Write a protein that binds this ligand. Structure first.
Ligand SMILES: CCCCCCCCCCCCCCCC(=O)O
Ligand SMILES: CCCCCCCCCCCCCCCC(=O)O
Lengths: 41, 269, 238, 250, 269, 238, 250, 41
């Protein structure tokens, strides 16, 4: 299952069950918050 | 973990103008189909799985194919260890400037039994030593040199006919990430090696036959497959449209932005 | 020892396998991780971010910068003709195949989600006009009249201070996941831009204004089946 | 309003009346290297205003036929004040650059610039076999212009369509990007933090990023409009920290 | 388990003189970069892992390569079991005078199928008996002698084409440590065998083919790889700069202290 | 029995594997462990301990004892010239490659930490002088003037009763781990010793005094990637 | 002060005025073999002062051209009092030696001695093929001098650069080492405990360690200074325990 | 994981997770304590 049989951390199965996502790094990189429901100016 | 569900929408005549944005801001609009148009409440059970960089790099792809023979420098295969040798995984790794990935190499080695005048002598199962020399380490010059004594260099010593050899490698870059793209010269005088070749010097991989010799020439092909795992992509990049020309530099021949269509209004079918 | 029966999948190198393997260098002290800005934990993030698309990919213009430029003019001629037209599916459509969502689509075989095309009017500040950017769902012919495009999903872009209207294709599909490869069953619709009103310009402003289309992925967007990209072709050893 | 902006990094200040929201590089504001993420044991030299100020580079005329320009930072900041002096007198340097590209154009000017900070924009040689010299890509004095078509020789592939890195220029918006559309914007500010694998790197051998200003819509103005439309890059390193005081490198 | 973090420092004009030490004391200065110079607070997440003697010896390296044939004393390979035969692991083990390590031998055996006039006869999978005769035990003289009956001698009986044989060996030295360096004569008269040969007499390793004979000569190469584990290094020594000449003595040819440079002020680049 | 699927890493001899193996002699009574003084549980301990380095490795002097001897003199000639100069990186620098830290560095591919060079004045007890031992971080030319060395990291060694000043290179690197092998990217700085003041000697003391440099590892020092040492070359069977 | 020292092991005492801190061998003080770590069942003979005293060996003149000397202990202590007598009359012996090398030089003398106790310094033969006799390395009466260059014959390789063990002499500081720098030190004391794999070993066949005194900086004195600068080794075994009373071996 | 499948102690995985270190045996072997912030004498 998820048991790691090798002591080294790199010698483990890929973390394919991690679906963390932060698109705001690329889609919303502006300093001032931009709301879609207001003019962008 | 599923993607955001399409919220129900209706007719709207307001000052919100969700569709009206500004690309001048550099911010991609966070609008949804419910914003611009009128959409039904759709619960999106679709998930951004297999699109994760962890899952995307999970697919193991070849990075090094070479032919080393049994019975000079052609009896063992030398690999300056870089993902850029094979274009298939290189463009995947070149989607991000920095990737902190524990790389899982899975060597696939198949003997060829080169066509010769005499091939009636059957050699026993060929063992293969895939030694890894760290950068600056002793590089072997012969198939029987002292470097093959793996006092410190890791080596699978894989035997043919068994499961393909696989030795997971940790993050070994001197920096905090693997710079797939590095617009920097090797020397501070800004003269030398420009590109990923500078920072991505992760040693060499020497592949040989543990068997001393064979009655007839056998040229086993070492097909190194690199599976990145525990990846930390840090600066995304577009795929390289141009075909890869050099494995030590980003040098490219100019290529069209896209497949040209007959007209700006040309919609097939 | 322990009686172990080898499964018929033993001694195989499956490419997409979550199998633990012995470490090459055990207890290797990896360089400490630093917070490098922009951590990509999913490539649908780079799909979501805008990307200028080569709408005007007519022969020769792909080499130059005019591939992305969508030409508009203050002329009565060809006003009843689309500003542009192309296929919605980013997988195989010439316009959208090499863009950020398309490039992260041809690395996959199935795609689902709402493509949003942000259209930036790169013309004179006093150049005001109304366009009709319309996604027509498949099953019918490509819109040849502005009324036909209006019958499908559409947004009227009133060019002004914002200068960017986002045409969000509302995932009008008969299946949960359209196929990236060109297949008529999961064939997407047609995105066509027309003139709802001419691009009225003052006498001191150029008539031949330019428009840039930014095809971007929404929060709905996802890809399901990974595949080697057809774009990256390697003729031989580098 | 969001159009007005004012950045007072260091002695020099930039005030704009039509400037969209500033693109923080990848959503993370630049900061000094933390002790957790620091690998150099030297005492960091941190000039808060001596080096962290707006440096106005050479202004390049945005011609109708101009395909694009690129600046290679921080090497483009050589011979530019105490930031360049600290570059010369330090082995390792880190800085978060809030580039501000000023393109003052009238309301009758048609054009659009993708001002994009590409981290580690490895440039391709014009002839793939050889490698270009440092002068071809370095931007010490003047921006290096992207050519409209393919060029040959021991130079940098300046094909604007491929952005010089074999990468679709329209996809360059994947990097921290801001658009100067003369319809709306006359200036773009990208606050790009220090972006590199190593927490601190030499500022000569390695260019932390490249500011590529790509006119996607070429400048279009009718007769009588100002023909000399300048594209002026005003880049301000922020939280600039240097380790390894050494002999000046020239 | 990480290394000590670089504590923050500042300007100092005091009588502490941390830089001023005395090598006459024989004590290496415990100074830090914060002491001599002014350093920022750097949290050193770097760890002295893979530098541990346990990890350093973890890399398995060859110690014995020999060719024994199928179809006299050339049909089986005899190894006076010592780490010193191969220089790669010998210098690692010679970094310490005494190492109490449980040694993990991993025999890698590859058949060669010696080139002859006739090699058209295919022999079945060759089994290999790697017998260990403890010091003073019965040493075989033939490939079919009674000694090969392993009543007490451990033997893997490894078969070709399978996973490489591996039999972990405990600490078998008569003393409390393996004296890699032993400046002592075998006899109390101070006459006899000088060096590690005296104390490091850990028996012999006889490798043979379990198969009685083959139609054609097959000379399998036994490549013994020694992986020390549970190591207890007890007296550190410098690496031997001179190349190893004898496997039974430290005898050496004189070698330069380092690579000579053009001048005391010669700094390349 | 138990269904077992063999991973693609099965039946391989990885050198750096933590795999349990059957005992050659089961229940073997190992000789009882005794507290032998000096238990090395890490070779960075032998790196940390001082080691005379061959600074004066000019041709021929490596054979003799003068390789370690750093010559200093009470002469006005060549006072504006470095006492010595060499590369900081112990991996490939000729001076530091065969020393304790260097020898325990070329057994590895990556190295991180503060090298500390303890300089012992092996001259007359009344021979007093001031030296300027300077580590210059890379990115600039090797110091050719004492001012250039002063511009980098440096310590003034006032030779006296202590007679040993430790120049601790404060790990001025752009990466968490410099590479032991010679590569310009992780190329280290330059350690140069100059005369801050002449080596003033009484008339009864020799002018040509000697200095010994002890390159030692600090608590920060670590190595990350093991590799076979290039120094130990075996031409053939011993 | 740390420079003054006084060691009163046994009847003989050593008092020094310029002597740095004594180098306890590998940080562990010598002691009698504990019952836990003892493998010999004979009653241990433990002369507290009869054998555990300072024995002053032959003083060797430190010439300008002297490359080095070595003493092989405990065999160098043969014919030296009751320690040597107990060596002769016992099969197994253990001792922790606090060697004290005395090099009295004036303030005008330039030189430095690496006085290093190398445990199990296996010496290499001058001709690699053969093995040297016992006389070549044994130090019963006079120190065996390291040659400045390579020598040949059935002797010990005395190349000072290789320390006679194929090992970098500058790296010999890895073993318990103290420096006699005539600038500061005139005497070095190394309290080396019993260092061997076996808890007790014969004191003739096996030399527990070798005291190598290597002049790294050769003795340099101007005319008029004392030319006969002696290097006097005064080694005191501590906690000396012997098992196996037997016929005297000669 | 860390489970030992073989009865003999030597027949176990290497103790690669032990990073114990005492440099004071070699770097600080002097009998009298030497502090860097005071003259060594
Ligand atoms: C056979 C056992 C050891 C295996 C070592 C081979 C792999 C070495 C490490 C590769 C690092 C990642 C690839 C190069 C860096 C990059 O460009 O991302
Ligand atoms: C085939 C099963 C039995 C295997 C026995 C072979 C290994 C014998 C023990 C080797 C001890 C360590 C090496 C010699 C001593 C040394 O010099 O360190």
């Amino acid at each position: 299952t998820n048991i790691n049989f090798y002591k080294d951390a790199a010698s483990s199965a890929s973390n394919r069950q991690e679906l963390q996502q932060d698109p705001g790094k690329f889609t919303d990189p502006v300093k001032d918050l931009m709301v879609k429901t207001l003019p962008a100016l | 973990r599923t993607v955001a569900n399409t919220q129900p929408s209706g007719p709207s005549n307001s000052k919100e103008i969700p569709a009206l944005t500004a690309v001048e801001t550099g911010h991609t609009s966070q609008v949804d189909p419910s914003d611009t148009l009128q959409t039904r409440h759709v619960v999106n059970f679709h998930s951004r799985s297999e699109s994760t960089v962890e899952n995307f790099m999970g697919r193991a792809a070849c990075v090094f194919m070479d032919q080393y023979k049994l019975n000079s420098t052609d009896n063992f295969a030398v690999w300056t260890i870089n993902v850029r040798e094979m274009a298939q995984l290189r463009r995947k790794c070149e989607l991000f400037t920095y990737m902190r990935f524990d790389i899982e190499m899975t060597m696939v080695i198949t003997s060829c039994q080169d066509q010769g005048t005499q091939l009636e002598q059957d050699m026993p199962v060929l063992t293969h030593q895939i030694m890894y020399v760290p950068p600056g380490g002793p590089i072997p010059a012969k198939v029987d040199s002292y470097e093959w004594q793996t006092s410190t260099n890791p080596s699978v010593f894989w035997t043919e006919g068994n499961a393909p050899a696989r030795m997971s490698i940790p993050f070994i870059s001197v920096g905090n990430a693997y710079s797939l793209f590095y617009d920097g010269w090797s020397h501070f005088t800004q003269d030398g090696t420009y590109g990923y070749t500078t920072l991505n010097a992760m040693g060499k991989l020497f592949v040989r036959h543990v068997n001393k010799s064979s009655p007839h020439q056998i040229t086993s092909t070492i097909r190194v497959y690199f599976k990145p795992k525990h990846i930390k992509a840090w600066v995304p990049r577009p795929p390289r449209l141009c075909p890869y020309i050099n494995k030590g530099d980003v040098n490219f021949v100019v290529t069209e932005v896209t497949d040209a269509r007959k007209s700006i209004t040309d919609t097939p079918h | 020892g322990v009686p172990v029966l080898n499964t018929p999948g033993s001694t195989q190198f499956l490419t997409s396998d979550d199998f633990q393997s012995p470490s090459a260098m055990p207890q290797f002290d990896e360089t400490p991780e630093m917070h490098i800005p922009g951590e990509v934990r999913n490539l649908m993030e780079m799909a979501e971010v805008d990307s200028v698309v080569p709408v005007n990919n007519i022969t020769g213009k792909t080499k130059s910068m005019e591939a992305y430029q969508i030409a508009v003019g203050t002329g009565n001629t060809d006003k009843t003709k689309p500003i542009f037209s192309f296929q919605m599916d980013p997988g195989y459509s010439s316009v959208l195949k090499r863009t950020l969502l398309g490039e992260m689509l041809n690395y996959y075989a199935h795609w689902s989600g709402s493509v949003k095309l942000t259209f930036l009017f790169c013309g004179s500040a006093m150049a005001t006009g109304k366009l009709l950017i319309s996604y027509s769902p498949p099953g019918a012919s490509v819109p040849s009249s502005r009324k036909d495009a209006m019958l499908g999903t559409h947004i009227i872009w009133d060019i002004g201070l914002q200068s960017s209207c986002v045409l969000c294709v509302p995932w009008i599909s008969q299946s949960h996941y359209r196929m990236v490869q060109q297949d008529p069953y999961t064939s997407a619709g047609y995105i066509t831009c027309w003139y709802q009103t001419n691009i009225v310009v003052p006498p001191g402003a150029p008539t031949s204004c330019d428009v840039l289309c930014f095809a971007s992925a929404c929060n709905d967007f996802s890809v399901r089946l990974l595949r080697d990209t057809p774009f990256m072709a390697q003729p031989g050893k580098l | 309003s969001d159009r007005v902006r004012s950045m007072t990094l260091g002695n020099s200040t930039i005030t704009t009346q039509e400037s969209a929201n500033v693109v923080v590089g990848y959503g993370e504001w630049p900061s000094y290297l933390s002790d957790k993420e620091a690998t150099a044991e030297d005492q960091p030299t941190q000039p808060d205003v001596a080096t962290c100020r707006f440096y106005t580079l050479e202004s390049v005329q945005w011609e109708k036929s101009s395909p694009g320009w690129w600046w290679k930072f921080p090497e483009a900041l050589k011979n530019m004040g105490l930031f360049g002096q600290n570059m010369h007198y330090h082995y390792l340097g880190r800085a978060g650059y809030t580039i501000h590209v000023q393109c003052n154009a009238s309301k009758f000017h048609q054009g659009c610039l993708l001002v994009v900070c590409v981290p580690e924009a490895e440039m391709g040689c014009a002839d793939t076999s050889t490698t270009f010299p440092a002068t071809e890509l370095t931007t010490e004095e003047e921006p290096h212009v992207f050519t409209s078509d393919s060029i040959t020789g021991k130079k940098v592939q300046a094909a604007v369509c491929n952005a010089g890195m074999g990468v679709g220029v329209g996809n360059l918006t994947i990097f921290p990007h801001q658009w100067i559309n003369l319809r709306t914007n006359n200036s773009a500010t990208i606050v790009m933090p220090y972006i590199n694998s190593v927490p601190m790197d030499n500022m000569f051998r390695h260019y932390n990023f490249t500011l590529m200003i790509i006119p996607f819509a070429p400048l279009n103005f009718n007769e009588g409009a100002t023909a000399y439309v300048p594209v002026t890059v005003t880049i301000a390193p922020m939280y600039a920290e240097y380790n390894g005081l050494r002999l000046a490198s020239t």
